[PDB]
């Protein structure tokens, strides 16, 4: 790309570019601290053992955090951790606490 680039972008800030990060994009090498803000699911049919997470009386993992595990992804809540699945981990909209 020899030509230069445009510059009509406004508001950049650092990270946080949209209300939603899925309980997986927030998980980093270290167990930071995030939270889910929407566990909606317009999937024509997607549940599996995950139904347990929804039946755990929690939803949107409330305020907690995750810990990517090389392909796997676990969730850590204030006094409670769970092991979801990277498959559905990319559905609910979550963010940082």
UniProtKB/Swiss-Prot annotation:
Its main location: cytoplasm. One of its GO terms (biological process) is negative regulation of DNA-templated transcription. The keyword Phosphoprotein does not apply. One of its GO terms (molecular function) is DNA binding. GO terms for cellular component: cytoplasm. Coiled coil: none annotated. It is found in: Cytoplasm. Keywords: Cytoplasm, DNA-binding, Iron, Repressor, Transcription, Transcription regulation. The keyword Manganese does not apply. Belongs to the DtxR/MntR family. Iron-binding repressor of the dipheteria toxin gene expression. May serve as a global regulator of gene expression. Represses ripA under iron excess. Homodimer. This is Diphtheria toxin repressor. It comes from Corynebacterium diphtheriae (strain PW8).
């Amino acid at each position: 790309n020899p030509i230069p680039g445009l510059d009509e972008l406004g508001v950049g800030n650092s990270d946080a570019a949209a209300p939603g990060t899925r309980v997986i994009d927030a998980a980093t090498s270290m167990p930071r601290k995030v939270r889910i803000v929407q566990i909606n699911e317009i999937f024509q049919v997607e549940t599996d053992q995950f139904t347990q997470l929804l039946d755990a009386d929690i939803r949107v993992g409330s305020e907690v955090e995750i810990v990517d595990r090389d392909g796997h992804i676990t969730l850590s809540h204030n006094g409670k951790d769970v092991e979801l699945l990277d498959d559905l981990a990319h559905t609910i909209r979550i963010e940082e606490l």
